[PDB]
Amino acid sequence: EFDAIKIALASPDMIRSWSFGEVKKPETINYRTFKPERDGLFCARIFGPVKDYECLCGKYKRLKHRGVICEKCGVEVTQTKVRRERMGHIELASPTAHIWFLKSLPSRIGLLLDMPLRDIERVLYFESYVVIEGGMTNLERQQILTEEQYLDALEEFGDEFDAKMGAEAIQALLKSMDLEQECEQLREELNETNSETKRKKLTKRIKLLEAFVQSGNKPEWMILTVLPVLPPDLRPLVPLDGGRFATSDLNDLYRRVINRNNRLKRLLDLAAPDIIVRNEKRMLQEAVDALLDNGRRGRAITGSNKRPLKSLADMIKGKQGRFRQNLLGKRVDYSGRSVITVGPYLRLHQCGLPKKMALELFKPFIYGKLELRGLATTIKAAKKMVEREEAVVWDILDEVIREHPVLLNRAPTLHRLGIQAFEPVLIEGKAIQLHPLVCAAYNADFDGDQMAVHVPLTLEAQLEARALMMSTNNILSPANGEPIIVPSQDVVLGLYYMTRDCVNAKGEGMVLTGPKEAERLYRSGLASLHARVKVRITEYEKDANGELVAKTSLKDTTVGRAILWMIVPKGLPYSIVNQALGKKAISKMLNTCYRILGLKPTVIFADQIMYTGFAYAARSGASVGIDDMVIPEKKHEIISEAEAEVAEIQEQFQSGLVTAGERYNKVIDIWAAANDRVSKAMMDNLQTETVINRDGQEEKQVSFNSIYMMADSGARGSAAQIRQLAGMRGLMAKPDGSIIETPITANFREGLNVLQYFISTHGARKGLADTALKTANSGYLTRRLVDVAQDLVVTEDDCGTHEGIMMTPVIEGGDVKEPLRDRVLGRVTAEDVLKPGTADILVPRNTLLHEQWCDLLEENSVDAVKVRSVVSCDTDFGVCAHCYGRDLARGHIINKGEAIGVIAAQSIGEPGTQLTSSIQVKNKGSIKLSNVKSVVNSSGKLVITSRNTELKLIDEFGRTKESYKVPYGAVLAKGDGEQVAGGETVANWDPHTMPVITEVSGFVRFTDMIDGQTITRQTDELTGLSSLVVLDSAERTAGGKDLRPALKIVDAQGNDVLIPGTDMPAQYFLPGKAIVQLEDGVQISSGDTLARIPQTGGLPRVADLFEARRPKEPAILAEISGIVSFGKETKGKRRLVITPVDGSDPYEEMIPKWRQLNVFEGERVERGDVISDGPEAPHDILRLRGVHAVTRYIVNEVQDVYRLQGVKINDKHIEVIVRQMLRKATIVNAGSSDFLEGEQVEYSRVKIANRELEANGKVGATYSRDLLGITKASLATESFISAASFQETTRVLTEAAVAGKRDELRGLKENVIVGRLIPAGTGYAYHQDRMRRR
C-alpha cells in the first residue's frame, strides 16, 4: 500500500487542504445537553456526525442517506471513523512563529537569517525592532533596533523605511530571501575566509540552504498562518461521575489559543492603539508556543492544580509519547498474567496453564469448535454456554489445546530467552506451572514472580512458536555457547549426592553386573547409594563412520554413578559420570551431549536428569542445621594472635615509632591476613570435617557436611557466603569507602553485636541502593545498543573477501584468561592457516572452525589465527553469513536472514542489568623481545631504547604464556631469544625515574648551557654533592629560555661523536626537571643513565567505551611518520613538528607543556606510535592505526570488564556493535563522484558509488571513516523514523522536515512502527518478494 514516508513543511495552502472547516468559537459542549456546539473545538458540521449514520438534527438516520448533507445543521451523514480522521484549521488573525524551528538548538530561523537566537526571540515576542529593506539609510538589513532607536529613526528617517515588530517582521524577512544568491555568496566566503569557526558556521548554513532548495519546501512556511487542529476523537472528553468532563490538555491549549486569537481579531476590528494589539499578538504567540512544545520559553502554562499541560510535541516525544507507548510496544489481547509455580512433573516442552486462564484466552477457538460441531447455532448461545461452564466446553478446550503453543514471557525480558513457547497442559488451580529448568533462562525464581501468557492465532504464528520459540530449540544461550538449561539448585545437589564415594559404606567392594542390579540393590537397601564397587558397563562410542560401536568393560565406580549411568544415552563416554558431578560438570555433560548426539537426545537427557536429580535429592534428605555450621575450634589461637599483633602494632605506635596512616594500613593488612587464614582453616576443617574408618587405620575423606556439600556441589552458595557463615564475615567499608579499622570479628552462627550489625547494614543498604540506581543505567545502555544495531541483518551468504582480524589468546599478565579455543570457535577463517613447522596448510581458507577443527588446532599448538569478522565485511546494507559465523544458539552456520544486531545488543545488555617494578616469570619458557633496540652497558645489563617493547614468554611449542611491557631504560639480566629460568625476576627498573640513557661512550660536555639562567644550582647538604638541574622555560630565568640545552659526548680531544647509523652528531636535548647528578667533564659509557627525570569502573566503563567518549588525558599520537622536531617558544604551550622524508613536511602539532613527553628529538616514529602516555582515544586509533586496531581495542577493553565481573559473552556481539558505530564516513576528495568536499555520508553509499565508478573509467572518491558513538550513530540514521522513536524526537523531526527527508523503512523499529512483516526472520522471504517485484 506504501513503501516510503516523507516529511516536509506544511504550507498554509496544504494545511487548508487538510482541513474540512475553520474553527472559530472556543466552546466544546453546552454542559446541559451533550450535543456539540455550533463551530467549537468539538463540532459536527466540521468534523462529522456524533453517531454512525445519524445526523445531528435527527432528520436522516439510515444507511440510504450515505453522502447527503442536510440543510438544517450541515452534518455530512456518514460513519464516525471520519470524525476520528477529519481535521480542522484556525485562521490566525496574525502570523505566528513555529516554536520548534525557533528553538531547535540550532534554531532554523536563527541561522537561516544568520542572526542570534537572542535577537530573534526579542523581535518575535514584541520587545525589539528589526528593519526590512534598509535602503539608502544608516541601517543594515538584519540589524536590531529598540523602541528608543526606533523612535529616533522615525523622527530622523521619516521617508520610506520599513521596520516591523513580531512574527510579521520575521515572515517578511524570510519571504525577502532567495536561496541561490545566499548559497553562492556563502560558498565563496567559505572558500576565501580561511577561518576555522566561521568556516564551520558557513558549511552549516550552506548545508541548511541546500537542504531547503533541494526539497519542495519554502522558508516562509516556518511562520504559521493557519493552525492545524487535531481531530476531535484523538483528544476526546470522557464524561465522569457527574456532568463534569475530563479536560484533555490539548483541548485547554486549543481553547486558549483560539480565545487569544479571537481577542486579537476583535481588537483589530476596532483598530485599537498599537500597544494593546502588540500585547495581544504577544499573548497569541505565547499561546501557540504552549500548544506546540510547551515549556521552551517561560513556563509551561498550567491549567489546573499546578502541573504542566501536555503539548503535541510532549505527546509524541518521550517515554509517554506515542512512540515508546503505543507504537514500539502495544497492549495485546489474548494475554493473561498470574503467579508461577514449579510443577516438576512437566516435560521440557510444556507448561502448566491454569484452566480458568485457558478458558478465558481461547474463547474464540471454543466458539469456533462449538459452531463446527453444531452445538450452538449462534455466537450468543456459544458465549452463554462458555460463561456457564458446562461439562461439554471442557472437552472442547482439551481438543483445541492439543497442539497450540503459548508464549510465556516474564516482565523484564532482558534477552531473547526471556520469552519462550510451551505446549499448554490443563492444570487445576490459578498459577502457571513452569518447568524448573527454564528458570535460569528467565532468571525467575518462585518467590512470587509473575509471568504473562500470549496465545498465537495464525498458522504462521503457531509454526513460528513451534519451530523457533519452543524451549526444546532454545538450549544454548545466544550470548555464549554454554547451555542455558543447566540444572540449577536441587537437581545438581541430587546428582552431586548420588555420584560420590566414601571410604566405607554398606556392601563396599562387591562386583555388579550392570547398572540395573545396582539400582535394584539401592532400592532394596542392601548397598548404600555411595559405595565403591565394580560395575560392568556397556558404553557406546561413535568413533566409527556414524555408527555406535559397543564396548563392555569392568569399571570401578559407586552405586550412585551406575544408577545415573542408566540414564545417559548411548553415545557418551562413561568418564563423564565417574566424577563428583558438580554444577559445572553437569553443564559440561549436557554440552557434550548436545555436541555429540544432537537435540532430541539432549532434551530427553535434560528431562531424565532433572527427574533423577530431584528423586535422589529427596531420597538423600540433604537438610541443614545449626550444628552443620561447624566453628573452627582452632580459631581461638588465630584470633588471639591477630589481636596480639594489632596490640603490638599499637605498642609500637604509642611509642611514636609509627604514624597514624601507616598504623592504619598495617592494621588493615594484618586483619586481612587473619581473615584469609581463618577462612582457610575453616574451609579445610569443613571439607575434611568427616573422617570415617571401621576396617583398620584411619582414612580422611571429603566431608558430608550439609553446608560444604551444598556449596561444593555448586547448587547455592560459594566461598564468600560459606566463609561468612562460620568464619569472621570479613571487612566492611563505610559509605565513604574508608574500611573500618575493627571489622566484624563474629560470624552469623555467633551473634553479631550491635555495632557489627550497624556496619553490616551500611553495606547492605549501599548494595540495595546501588542495585536500584544501576538498573537504570543498564536499561539505558541496552536500549541504546538495541536502537543502534537493529537494521543490521544477515542478507548475503558470503561476501567473498580475504580480510580478517588476527585472533590470538588474550593474557592480561597472569595465566591464560581466555584461550584461543573460545576466541576462534565458530568463526570462519580469513586466510589459510599453515602448520607452525613449515608451510603446511592445516586448515582451509573458508571452513567453519567447529569443535573438531578447533581441537586439532589446539593439538598442533597454533597460536595465531586470522578469521573473517563482521566489522571487515564489505556487504551493502547487511553482513554476509560467513563473516558472522556460528549462530551460537545452534550448532550450525548462521542462517540467511536471522537478525544479529538485536541479538548482539540483548546479549551485551543482559549482564549489565544483573551485575557490573619486577617481572617475576612464573613458567619455564623462552624469552623473546619484539620492537626492541637494546645496548649492552659496562655492568653487563641490557637497557632498551624503544618504547613499545613487550616481553613475550615463549614456551618450547612457540606459544606465548606471559606478556609484559618494557619501558624506556629497563634492566634485563638475560639476553634476547635465550631461554631463561622461571622463578626469579627477569626485568627491573625504577618506576619513579625516566633515564637519559645514551647510545655512545665518551665524556660529558654540556653544550649550549650557561649557568645562572639555563639551570639552577642546588647544593645538597645531606649528600654533599651539588646538582646541575635544568628548569623549564617558565621555571628558569629569562636569560636563556629561548635556547634548549643539548647534552653531547666528545672524545679525548674535544670533537663530537657521530650517531651510529646516521651522519648527525649524537646530542641529547635535555628537558627541564632533569636530575643530572653528574658534573661537567665526567666519563660515561654506552647505555648508562645520565639523568633521572621524575614523573574506569564497571558498567560506566562499558557505556563510555561504546559511546566513544574522549578520555580526559588522551595519549597524543603521530598522524604521519617521519623525523621529529620542535617549533616555537611555547606560545600557549609546546609545539611539535613532524617532517616526512618526501611528504607533507609542515605537519605540526600543539602539545601541552605540563605533560611529560615520550619520544626524544632523534626518533623516526611510525603512524600510531604513542607520543605521550594515557588512555588512547578511539577516534585517534581509527584515524591512524585503522579499523582493525580500533575494533580490537574496543573488544579487548569491554571483555576486560566483563571477565573481571565473571561473565562470558562471545566477541561477535561486540564486533557487530562496533561495526554499527563506524557506519559513517566523511569524504575528503570529491574524486569523480558527485559528493561534496567534507559532508558525512553512509559508508555503504560511498562504497557502492566507488564500486560503480571503478568498473567504469572514472576514478572513485577516497573516503575517511569516522567513529561515532552509539547515541550519535543511532541518531544519525538514513531513516528519520528510527531516530525519532529514539531520543531527541523534536530535533530529529525538525531535521527531517527542514531537509524534506524520505523514509525507505528498511529497518526493524521502522517496520514495527508501520506495522508490517519484519525483515528479520520468517518475513525475510516476504521482503525478498518485495525487493523482487518493484
Binding site: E1, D3, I5, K6, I7, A8, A10, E85, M87, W100, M222, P228, V229, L230, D233, L234, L312, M315, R322, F323, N326, G329, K330, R331, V332, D333, Y334, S335, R337, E360, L361, P364, K369, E371, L372, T413, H415, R416, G418, I419, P456, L457, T458, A461, E464, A465, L468, M469, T782, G897, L1293, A1297, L1308, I1313, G1315, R1316, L1317, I1318, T1322, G1323
Partner: protein, 99 residues
C-alpha cells in the same frame, strides 16, 4: 487475569491496561526486541497489528477464528494513524507516499 477480547481505549484503539478493568498485558519494547532477535516475524506482526489496534484486522481475525480459519489481514495499526494526525497537527507534513 486473562482476556480474549473486551473494551478498548479511545485515543488509540488499543486494549485497556490493568485488571480492575478487563485489560490485556503490555507487550513492552524489550518484548518486541525479544521477538525480533528470534525469527519471529509473523508472530510479531500478529501481536502488534491484529491483536492490538487494527480494528478491521481484529474484527476479521475474530470472525475467521469463529469460522475455524486461522488467517489474518495485516492492515495498518490505528496508533500509527494517531501519530500521523498528531504530527500533521503541527506544521510538519507527514504522509504515506504512493507505492
Amino acid at each position: 487475569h486473562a482476556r480474549s477480547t473486551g473494551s478498548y481505549s479511545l485515543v488509540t484503539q488499543q486494549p485497556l491496561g490493568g485488571k480492575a478493568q478487563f485489560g490485556g498485558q503490555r507487550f513492552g519494547e524489550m518484548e518486541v526486541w525479544a521477538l525480533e532477535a528470534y525469527g519471529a516475524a509473523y508472530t510479531l506482526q500478529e501481536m502488534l497489528t491484529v491483536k492490538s489496534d487494527d480494528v478491521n484486522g481484529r474484527t476479521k481475525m475474530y470472525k475467521n477464528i469463529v469460522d475455524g480459519n486461522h488467517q489474518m489481514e495485516p492492515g495498518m495499526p490505528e496508533s500509527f494513524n494517531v501519530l500521523l494526525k498528531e504530527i500533521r497537527s503541527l506544521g510538519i507534513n507527514i504522509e504515506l507516499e504512493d507505492e
